[PDB]
């Protein structure tokens, strides 16, 4: 992207900007020995309000001037900072939305704008909320023996039920059979760090998308997109002759979708399905877990969250769309770990030409970087970073936060489009568990929670917790 | 070859199983600074049994007990661990057993053994006897004038020589005549690291051979090999066919058994080229490594620099059935080869999913034998970093596991030419030390400090002042 | 080049010579961490006269002897050490000078040489002078209020205008007219590192060149180029108006094509392409250094102002001949790029396996000369470390080994521009001592460190205070 994948190095020099010495060809990768979170909280402290890097050849600039993340999410989304970092080809899955880039990505968005509305989300709960019954049903069995639940396995059978059942209607008790078709399918499919940055070695070695398209050597071969191609397949026709309806899945929504910009092709609406598997499970599962940890080891907050869910549930009643969004604590409880926790971490944008943002330059083929991590325990924005307090989201603490510092889901055209989706689902595990257990750590416990080192945030070692039957 | 050559640096903690952190793109190579061994050394002394680690984006997990080696190489070698780390485009080199995969490598390794049974390494010790006394008559070389002495020169032409006549026909010395076309040509060959993993760049890059293949980018030339190529063409076509002057060495009996689907003859010059590569920098560097323990542990080597005597008195032609014989020799190369394993490791990759043991192994990674740290592992061995010849002489060892001490694997795919080049070693080293003796010069290492690389080797050449007799 | 591309990290060892032991596919690319200096320095202390590392896959042999060095960049310069290190797809940039090789390099170098002749850098001095004037305002215009200034944005703006102005035959202010679409485009050029080895991952990939000259996959891509290969084609039809002929680098390759076969008109543009490689910001930085030297060492700079003053009086516009009069200013130069070589490393390729001077020498291996190591050696040079014009002296003439003492390299392919880059170089020194002095604020960074890059440069731009004189 960045001159023609011709070395970049004294970029940063030339423009006056601070940032780590880089060795030649790989640029400052060995900076990445603490993790992309450490080095991007390290370099904020160090360098200020700006700096740069290089992830190989890939020239990286990291901005934190709430003002110059608005201009680079918002006012020149579309003229300048419309895509992400260039990827490789992976064929058909080009036009899934999050590898879609300028003019098909803005139809794409469009398009798949109206699937994610609040009106039609309404109608998804009733399928979510069933595997937060699911969910209980095999948390219980744990909790009567009373032995360590390792919860990335309880949560990620919970996110694959949530997802197989709301992308392609499949309904499965994920955790009781790993060996259905779907799953083993899905967690194979699931295999591929497909976003992240270092997915192939493009930021090292840029050439390797030039020569592959050219050599039509595909990363993302015909063999693993199969299944889920076929399943998509046998699927559009066979159970909706059925004129009786129903169907409210992801899969009917995009169904519905296609007649009288524009028009959205079976391939397309295939590579919406898998890109929604990829940006969901391992996030979802991971929240999840996180949202766990910082419960059972503030047990205060444990307890007074339980006590609001009672509240307004009374008798572990079944959780409902309306009297989910009237739960103001659970709601400061989901923002303030992914406040702590923000599974991005990171938000990108490659600068597609010459520009001037708020006074700084900005050359083209550069990525533009805002370091969510490092901005969401930024003292100069929060008062005990490091501490998790549920209270600053409290509505009398709602204009002191800046929409551009607290970015779990990015701004702009190109956040989240699953944002609504994502905190529906996980609050309904939450109510539903947290209604019929209560949560404590033992020694089994990884106390404190050490990080993923990774682009995508998830704990270290697995999230192990004891669990009692409740009130 | 591991998930679409892919970003992979999320296996081993998706197992449980643990390990040194990989950097991007990298992986753990930074680690290799310490060298190959004393890496998989502190790996083994820090997350115990069994440990991963990323080669580039080539996933490597090292295993250690032996039930798991031996279902590896063993047991589920024809099925799933068939194969070393995939080749990039070789040419006519791809016969070669070493780079022959799944059944068109059990083909070639049926043409072979034949060619490597004791039935017939006992005709050929004639011909490598020759050269026992061609390196003897060399190594008087400064000797005798009185100067520290570099033990790599006299075994490397002497590793040379034996090689050359034994898989050509064609003796030579090296050292004497070393602008001969053919030491020159097979030493241009010995400058490729052939059979390292990091040969090519495939561990970090492994998009590199579809791309190489596709574009008939050749890595290893027909240049590099076209002379012994159009020489085993002369040696084998005009060949040794209208005169019988019947020759006994690899050549000949490769030749013979074409003449019993078959071996075709660039399947021939094929495996003669691997035989060098196999045999040449192996053969000397055990030979420099025993040097350099009995000269520093002297009594060992008087206990047989005339036990060698005690079989054949004195200054006897060294035939076959006299150099079985000595057992304690047998097992003082034993002990150098426990010391020092020139592999380091061994590797298969994993064909496809598959748990053996109590462990899943996932297609495409590379399951490694870390023969090194088990040779020095304590759990095995009282005083690891001894060199104490008879720890491995009489049933007294029928505690020694032919999965810990494997400096020539097991299984299927093992050394083809393990009985060969111990012949070989042993033979040579009868015919130095039963006309010389070793003395720590004020120059050699001590202790022996290794090569950081992929085979093992003294860091420094190894350096002895050189005796009378 | 190097034995097919194939890992070579066994060679060194193997051929009884020492270095840094190398990585695993990244050769000793960690001990770059250092910069290029950095590392030739303790290379030289820690294994002597020769050693040898890897980049990435690439052996780079190190020598040091002159005796060999002679060997390598004059004797065996036709025969064996012709071309630097290999290059890739670059379209009609092949047959630029530097990047041209063998028989093509020859021609070159012979079709070019009468333009850099002494006698025609003469008629050339007129026209690069009145860019000093240019650098006496612009340079007062920062000094005229009493903030800092740094060097870079005065020298830089310099070097460019005199590079455009010679090598395009244009006349612009690039401080004053940025937007000028030759200043535009001589910047976006100006972006490549184009003749850095880190340019591509040649030395860790070496078989990017092989695939992308088969694939046309190019890296100097020709948008890159157009503004400025197209103003050629519309500027010499212009002068040929047979009348009026400026003495510009365009003028003498366009001399050069009318009545051994001539120089080709794309072949003109690869030229005059390469000289802005060559000339921006080597000038540029030599300059801030050059200054650095002069304002922490202050009784150079009087005694350099003097010599100046007392050739020079009442600001006199200097002239060619009066410039090469300038003895101390000479030695300044020279002394500076004793310190602060530009290129920090002479390399060639070696063609065919050499003994020179009895070292055996394979094909493939990068010959480097340790330029900036070389030039702080204490065999040669008492306190390498200390700034001393005096080194350069005449009384301190054949103390000086030319194949010790290399900022233009040495042998037929040496700095073909030498005496312009000197002659330019001095111009501008001559202008900014005859109306300022300058000396060090709290900004100056003392001691200096330097660039890790491949191209030798001060790491924080040089900042200075500048005070006018009458
Ligand atoms: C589980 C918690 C989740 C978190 C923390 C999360 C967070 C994010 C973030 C930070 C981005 C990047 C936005 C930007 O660059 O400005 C993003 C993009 C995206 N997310 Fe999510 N997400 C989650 C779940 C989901 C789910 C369940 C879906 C739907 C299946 C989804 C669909 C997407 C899509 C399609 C994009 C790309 C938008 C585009 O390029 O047009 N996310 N998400
Ligand atoms: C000190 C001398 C030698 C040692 C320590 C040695 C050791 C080894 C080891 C450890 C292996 C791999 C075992 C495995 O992965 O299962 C091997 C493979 C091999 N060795 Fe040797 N070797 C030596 C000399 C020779 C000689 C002289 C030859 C023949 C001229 C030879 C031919 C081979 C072949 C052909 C293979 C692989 C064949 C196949 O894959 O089927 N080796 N050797
Ligand atoms: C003070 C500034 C300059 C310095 C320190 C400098 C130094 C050097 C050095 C060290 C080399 C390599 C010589 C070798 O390998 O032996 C070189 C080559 C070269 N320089 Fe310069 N140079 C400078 C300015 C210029 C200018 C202004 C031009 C032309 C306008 C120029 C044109 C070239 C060319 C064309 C070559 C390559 C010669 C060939 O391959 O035939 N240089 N220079
Ligand atoms: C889906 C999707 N499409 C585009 C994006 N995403 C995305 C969604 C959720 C999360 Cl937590 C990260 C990303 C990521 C992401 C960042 C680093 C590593 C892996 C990722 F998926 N990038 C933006
Ligand atoms: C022949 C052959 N084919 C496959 C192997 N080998 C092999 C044979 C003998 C030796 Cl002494 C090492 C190796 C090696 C080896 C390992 C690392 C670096 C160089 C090697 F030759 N073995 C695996
Ligand atoms: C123009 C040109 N053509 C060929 C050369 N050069 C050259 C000229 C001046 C300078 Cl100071 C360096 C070089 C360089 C050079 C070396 C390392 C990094 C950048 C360079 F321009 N090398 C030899």
Redesign the interface.
């Known amino acids: 992207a960045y ?5 970049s ?3 940063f ?2 423009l006056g900007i601070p940032g780590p ?1 880089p ?4 640029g400052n ?2 900076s ?2 603490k993790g992309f979170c450490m080095f991007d909280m390290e370099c904020h402290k160090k360098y200020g309000k700006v700096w740069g890097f290089y ?3 890939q020239p990286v600039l990291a901005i934190t001037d709430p003002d110059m993340i608005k201009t680079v999410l918002v006012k020149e989304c579309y003229s300048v900072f419309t895509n992400r970092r260039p990827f490789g080809p992976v064929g058909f899955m080009k036009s899934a939305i999050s590898i879609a880039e300028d003019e098909e990505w803005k139809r794409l968005r469009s398009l798949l704008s109206p699937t994610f509305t609040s009106g039609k989300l309404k109608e998804m709960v009733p399928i979510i909320a069933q595997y937060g019954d699911v969910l209980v049903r095999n948390l219980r069995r744990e909790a009567e023996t009373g032995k360590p639940v390792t919860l990335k396995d309880v949560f990620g059978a919970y996110s694959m039920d949530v997802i197989t059942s709301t992308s392609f209607g499949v309904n499965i008790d994920s955790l009781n059979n790993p060996q259905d078709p779907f799953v083993e399918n899905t967690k194979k499919l699931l ?3 497909f976003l ?1 940055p ?4 493009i ?3 840029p ?2 998308i ?3 398209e ?2 039509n ?1 595909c ?3 015909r063999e ?1 997109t199969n299944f889920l191609r076929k399943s998509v397949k046998r699927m559009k026709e066979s159970r909706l002759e059925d004129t009786q309806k129903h169907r409210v899945d992801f899969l009917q929504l995009m169904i519905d979708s296609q007649n009288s910009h524009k028009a959205l092709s079976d391939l397309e609406l295939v590579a919406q399905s898998i890109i929604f598997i990829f940006a969901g499970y391992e996030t979802t599962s991971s929240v999840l877990s996180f949202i766990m940890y910082e419960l059972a080891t503030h047990p205060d907050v444990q307890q007074k969250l339980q006590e609001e869910i009672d509240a307004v549930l009374p008798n572990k009643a079944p959780p409902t769309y309306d009297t989910v969004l009237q739960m103001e604590y659970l709601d400061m409880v989901v923002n303030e770990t992914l406040r702590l926790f923000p599974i991005a971490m990171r938000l990108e944008r490659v600068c597609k030409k010459d520009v001037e943002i708020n006074g700084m330059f900005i ?1 083209k083929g550069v990525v533009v970087m805002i370091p969510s991590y490092a901005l969401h325990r930024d003292p100069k924005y929060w008062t005990e970073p490091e501490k998790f307090l549920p209270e600053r989201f409290s509505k009398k603490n709602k204009d002191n936060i800046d929409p551009y510092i607290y970015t779990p889901f990015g701004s702009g055209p190109r956040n989240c489009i699953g944002m609504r989706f994502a905190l529906m689902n996980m609050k309904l595990a939450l109510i539903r568990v947290l209604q019929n257990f209560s949560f404590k750590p033992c020694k089994e416990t990884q106390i404190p929670l050490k990080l993923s ?2 682009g995508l945030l998830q704990p ?1 070692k697995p999230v192990v917790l004891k669990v009692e039957s409740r009130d």
Request: avoid cysteine; hydrophobic fraction near 50%; glycine fraction near 8%.
């Open positions: 001159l023609y994948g011709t070395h190095h004294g970029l020099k030339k010495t060795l030649p060809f790989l990768i060995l990445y020995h992830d190989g050849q295999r591929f760090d992240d270092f997915f192939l070695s930021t090292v070695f050439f390797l030039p020569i592959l050219v050599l050597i990363v993302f071969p693993v050359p080192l990774g270290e």
